């Protein structure tokens, strides 16, 4: 039932309006964000709204 989970590869929309590939580290249901780790090892909170799975629709 959860759409997002720890260890999931995702695309996250950043403050420049572009998508970046990352991996979910933590899911925060209270604030509806995930801590996402990016390719440069940076980690930021991203709104659920701005996150989608990288995996093929199937």
């Amino acid at each position: 039932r959860p759409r997002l989970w720890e260890g999931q590869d995702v695309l996250a929309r950043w403050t420049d309006g572009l998508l970046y590939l990352g991996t979910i580290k933590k899911v925060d249901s209270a604030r509806e964000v995930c801590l996402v780790q990016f390719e440069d090892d940076s980690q930021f909170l991203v709104l659920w709204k701005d996150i989608s799975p990288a995996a093929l629709p199937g």
Partner: peptide, 10 residues
């Protein structure tokens, strides 16, 4: 990855 660089997807 340390020293890695972010690029916009696709």
């Amino acid at each position: 990855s340390t020293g890695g660089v972010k690029k916009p997807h696709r």
